[PDB]
Design a protein around this motif. Structure first.
Motif, PDB file in Angstrom:
ATOM      1  N   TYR D  38       0.829  -1.197   0.000  1.00 43.48           N
ATOM      2  CA  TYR D  38       0.000   0.000   0.000  1.00 43.48           C
ATOM      3  C   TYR D  38       0.867   1.251   0.000  1.00 43.48           C
ATOM      4  CZ  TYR D  38      -3.641  -3.313   1.275  1.00 43.48           C
ATOM      5  OH  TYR D  38      -4.505  -4.384   1.296  1.00 43.48           O
ATOM      6  N   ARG D  83       3.561   0.763   3.145  1.00 47.79           N
ATOM      7  CA  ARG D  83       3.399  -0.273   4.155  1.00 47.79           C
ATOM      8  C   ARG D  83       2.867  -1.544   3.513  1.00 47.79           C
ATOM      9  NH1 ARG D  83      -2.201  -0.259   7.718  1.00 47.79           N
ATOM     10  NH2 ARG D  83      -3.615   0.084   5.951  1.00 47.79           N
ATOM     11  N   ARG D  85       1.316  -5.724   3.818  1.00 43.66           N
ATOM     12  CA  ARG D  85       0.253  -6.448   4.504  1.00 43.66           C
ATOM     13  C   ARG D  85       0.344  -7.926   4.157  1.00 43.66           C
ATOM     14  NH1 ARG D  85      -6.337  -5.847   3.466  1.00 43.66           N
ATOM     15  NH2 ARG D  85      -6.985  -7.133   5.246  1.00 43.66           N
ATOM     16  N   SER D  88      -3.939 -14.298   6.173  1.00 46.71           N
ATOM     17  CA  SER D  88      -4.427 -15.624   5.825  1.00 46.71           C
ATOM     18  C   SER D  88      -5.672 -15.894   6.656  1.00 46.71           C
ATOM     19  CB  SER D  88      -3.369 -16.703   6.078  1.00 46.71           C
ATOM     20  OG  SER D  88      -3.590 -17.836   5.254  1.00 46.71           O
ATOM     21  N   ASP D  96      -3.686 -11.327  10.119  1.00 48.69           N
ATOM     22  CA  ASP D  96      -3.846 -10.171   9.236  1.00 48.69           C
ATOM     23  C   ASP D  96      -3.077  -9.024   9.890  1.00 48.69           C
ATOM     24  OD1 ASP D  96      -4.537  -8.194   7.481  1.00 48.69           O
ATOM     25  OD2 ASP D  96      -6.689  -8.630   7.501  1.00 48.69           O
ATOM     26  N   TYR D  98       0.003  -5.728   9.370  1.00 50.93           N
ATOM     27  CA  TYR D  98       0.601  -4.738   8.489  1.00 50.93           C
ATOM     28  C   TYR D  98       2.038  -4.466   8.912  1.00 50.93           C
ATOM     29  CZ  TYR D  98      -4.017  -3.710   6.571  1.00 50.93           C
ATOM     30  OH  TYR D  98      -5.242  -3.799   5.952  1.00 50.93           O
TER      31      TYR D  98
END
Lengths: 106, 109, 109, 108, 109, 109
Positions: D38, D83, D85, D88, D96, D98
């Motif tokens: 991202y 960033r 990420r 699963s 999950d 970041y």
């Protein structure tokens, strides 16, 4: 949460039958479907595998899945139950059917 | 992997007495968390969750990883199949397993 | 993708005064659950969690999805970088996000 | 719990050259599954998801639990914070998380 | 012509405090029978059944046709929507009605 | 000493490509009957049975006593351990054997 039908079945050797389960009272759709069988004398229900005389169908549109057994035999008597589960974190579930008792005569 | 042993598999009783099912979590490192019991009465097409209290006595033993359901003052209408459920959402060891089931037949005389 | 908007990015204060961070959960349908604040002192490869207490006052506004931390009676030793954390293990809406961080410099005179 | 170590933390480059981020899943028994990158441009917290290809090159090494993003032919507009990420939904090992982020400054 | 009046409509509390909902069956000749309470966490779209015990105290007053739920030791995670349900399968006068719902917001500091 | 030789032992592939396992029943007078394939994703704690279809193509060759599994359109999530199983309850020649397993690593780039 899932209506299994019919509740009782009586058939003769060589014929065919069909169960049907429908997911009700849920916002989630069908995902993983299974069918189990408990033969007379058994101690642990056994999962059925799709193929040959065992014909499984799934209708995602109507939230219904079926199991058809052809060329019935006396040894096929017992109880059959369905299972529907999903691990989707937004709509997970794991419910069993009411069951169907099958009696095959000759 | 994770499992749950429901016992007994068949039960036959008379009206007015009591019975008891038992489920035990086996082959898992996780302990009990959420426990449920389901019943399908004769003439019903699905499993219905039981609400603990009064005539339905529920117990949970975290030490032995076992939970039971006791029904007192049995009646003919209580005949059917009963199955248990044990689930946990703990991210380190989550599970959701059902019992093998118990067929109950209540007679009179 | 959910994040967390930490403000301000830089802070410079004198001894004895106070400062305030603020974090807001954005781009997510889940609400606040567990909130934490962390600190990295100058000259360290590790992080220490801040405990709620007298001069360390924390507030949470679930309605606006915002949580803040205020530190009173600042000292030169309070210099460093501070970052927030918001996490939830709810299986239907889980998340674990950190703040961008705030660099704090406490002077004297 | 599972986290992700993003490196480097700061990058300064000139126009036309390239950079590379790297994220590694740490403190977890689960392996990599879905990975994303991202970008947040300077002057707003708005975030845009990056699509692989052309000037954006992404790699995943399941063996070492590491995935990278390379951006070629940098431009002044590419300045900002990036960033990663990694998530699963496998119910036996779900996560999950970041990355810490990397501040990029492109000069000329 | 047979409903249930749930009150209050909105609740705002701080962590550690307690709240209480109340539902009353109105415009019906039947009395209370089976009562339930449901919970919808922020971000979810599925109903969760509340279980009696500990901090969740469910009461029923058949005389005034009212049942209440009190939650103690509130937490930020308790935010969401709460709605009640009253059903009876009595063949002479059956019914099944839900409450209007109550939006709860739990803050801190 | 009925066994089954699973090959290959290790596989490394990129996203989008395909792989294929193969198991052969050796040192036995019985033929193939029921064949299955299992998968253990990274983090393990539970083996999952594979269902024929789509990207999973299963084959059985009774003549050579060999059955294979091919997975198309590989993904990073397909990494893990795969092992086969062959069993038959035929009263004249029953058996139940598992494969040695295959470690799969799916990369990208």
């Amino acid at each position: 949460r899932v209506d299994q039908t019919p509740q009782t079945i009586t058939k003769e050797t060589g014929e065919s039958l069909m169960f049907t389960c429908v997911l009700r009272d849920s916002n989630c759709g069908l995902s993983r479907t299974f069918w189990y069988r408990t033969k007379t004398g058994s101690t642990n229900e056994e999962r059925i595998s799709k193929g040959g005389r065992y014909v499984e169908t799934v209708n995602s549109g109507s939230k219904s899945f079926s199991l058809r057994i052809n060329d019935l035999t006396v040894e096929d008597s017992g109880t059959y139950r369905c299972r529907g589960k999903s691990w989707y974190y937004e709509c997970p579930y794991d419910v069993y059917g009411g069951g169907t008792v099958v009696t095959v005569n000759s």
